[PDB]
Each structure stands twice: as structure tokens, then as C-alpha cells.
Amino acid sequence: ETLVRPKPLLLKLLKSVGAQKDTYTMKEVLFYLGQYIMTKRLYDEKQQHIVYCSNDLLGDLFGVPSFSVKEHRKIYTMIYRNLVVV
Ligand SMILES: *CC(=O)Nc1ccc(NC(=O)C*)cc1
Ligand SMILES: [Cl-]
């Protein structure tokens, strides 16, 4: 029950999947992020652990063109840089 407040771009991403609160648990942020990736089918249909996020809000957010869902350290860093732990 780490509570977080997302930065503007991450809030836009969360609201695009129906999450309109301003404060979240980290678990909620990760959940919505995964729902965003799935709905927009940003993962590679043949290599489904690879997310291509160039030219998308998620890439603008993360500042990378792609990442593997298995890269937890990198993903947590990119998420942390886009919110404030309160
Ligand atoms: C179904 C599936 O792929 N589950 C899964 C569980 C855990 C992890 N990684 C870690 O817990 C670090 C990957 C995939
Ligand atoms: Cl932002």
C-alpha cells in the first residue's frame, strides 16, 4: 500500500484506460499499465514479452523505443521517474 501520484503523461495513460483517480497504489499503476499495453496491442504478436512503445504515449513517457516485460529493474525505474511516492 505504497501510494503514488502520477505525473501528467502517466496520468493521461491511466485515464485512457478508465482510471480517473489522482492517487493510486503502485499495484494499481502496474495493473493499468499492463491493461494499456494489452488494449493497444503494443506487444509483438510473435514475441509477446517485447513491448514496442515508440510513437506512442508510453514511449514519450518512458523515453525508450521498446522493452521486455522481463526487464523489471528498468521498468520500475521508468515508472518511478513518472510519479511521486506520497
Ligand atoms: C504466466 C507468467 O508468465 N508469470 C510470470 C511470473 C513472474 C515473472 N517474473 C518475476 O516474478 C520476477 C514473470 C512471469
Ligand atoms: Cl509527465
UniProtKB/Swiss-Prot annotation:
Record: disease: Seems to be amplified in certain tumors (including soft tissue sarcomas, osteosarcomas and gliomas). A higher frequency of splice variants lacking p53 binding domain sequences was found in late-stage and high-grade ovarian and bladder carcinomas. Four of the splice variants show loss of p53 binding.
Note: MDM2 RING finger mutations that failed to ubiquitinate p53 in vitro did not target p53 for degradation when expressed in cells.
UniProt region (Sufficient to promote the mitochondrial pathway of apoptosis), positions on chain: 1-77
Description of its domains: Region I is sufficient for binding p53 and inhibiting its G1 arrest and apoptosis functions. It also binds p73 and E2F1. Region II contains most of a central acidic region required for interaction with ribosomal protein L5 and a putative C4-type zinc finger. The RING finger domain which coordinates two molecules of zinc interacts specifically with RNA whether or not zinc is present and mediates the heterooligomerization with MDM4. It is also essential for its ubiquitin ligase E3 activity toward p53 and itself.
Subunit record text: Interacts with p53/TP53, TP73/p73, RBL5 and RP11. Binds specifically to RNA. Can interact with RB1, E1A-associated protein EP300 and the E2F1 transcription factor. Forms a ternary complex with p53/TP53 and WWOX. Interacts with CDKN2AIP, RFWD3, USP7, PYHIN1, and RBBP6. Interacts with ARRB1 and ARRB2. Interacts with PSMA3. Found in a trimeric complex with MDM2, MDM4 and USP2. Interacts with USP2 (via N-terminus and C-terminus). Interacts with MDM4. Part of a complex with MDM2, DAXX, RASSF1 and USP7. Part of a complex with DAXX, MDM2 and USP7. Interacts directly with DAXX and USP7. (Microbial infection) Interacts with herpes virus 8 protein v-IRF4.
Native organism: Homo sapiens
Function in brief: E3 ubiquitin-protein ligase that mediates ubiquitination of p53/TP53, leading to its degradation by the proteasome. Inhibits p53/TP53- and p73/TP73-mediated cell cycle arrest and apoptosis by binding its transcriptional activation domain. Also acts as a ubiquitin ligase E3 toward itself and ARRB1. Permits the nuclear export of p53/TP53. Promotes proteasome-dependent ubiquitin-independent degradation of retinoblastoma RB1 protein. Inhibits DAXX-mediated apoptosis by inducing its ubiquitination and degradation. Component of the TRIM28/KAP1-MDM2-p53/TP53 complex involved in stabilizing p53/TP53.
Subcellular location: Nucleus, Nucleoplasm; Cytoplasm; Nucleus, Nucleolus; Nucleus
Name of the protein this chain belongs to: E3 ubiquitin-protein ligase Mdm2
Family, per entry: Belongs to the MDM2/MDM4 family.
Induction: By DNA damage.
SWIB/MDM2 domain: residues covered: 2-85
Region Necessary for interaction with USP2: start-end pairs: 1-86
Post-translational modification as stated in the protein's UniProt record: Phosphorylated at multiple sites near the RING domain by ATM upon DNA damage; this promotes its ubiquitination and degradation, preventing p53/TP53 degradation. Autoubiquitination leads to proteasomal degradation; resulting in p53/TP53 activation it may be regulated by SFN. Also ubiquitinated by TRIM13. ATM-phosphorylated MDM2 is ubiquitinated by the SCF(FBXO31) complex in response to genotoxic stress, promoting its degradation and p53/TP53-mediated DNA damage response. Deubiquitinated by USP2 leads to its accumulation and increases deubiquitination and degradation of p53/TP53. Deubiquitinated by USP7 leading to its stabilization.
Residues of the full protein shown: 25 to 110 of 491
Tissue-specific expression: Ubiquitous. Isoform Mdm2-A, isoform Mdm2-B, isoform Mdm2-C, isoform Mdm2-D, isoform Mdm2-E, isoform Mdm2-F and isoform Mdm2-G are observed in a range of cancers but absent in normal tissues.
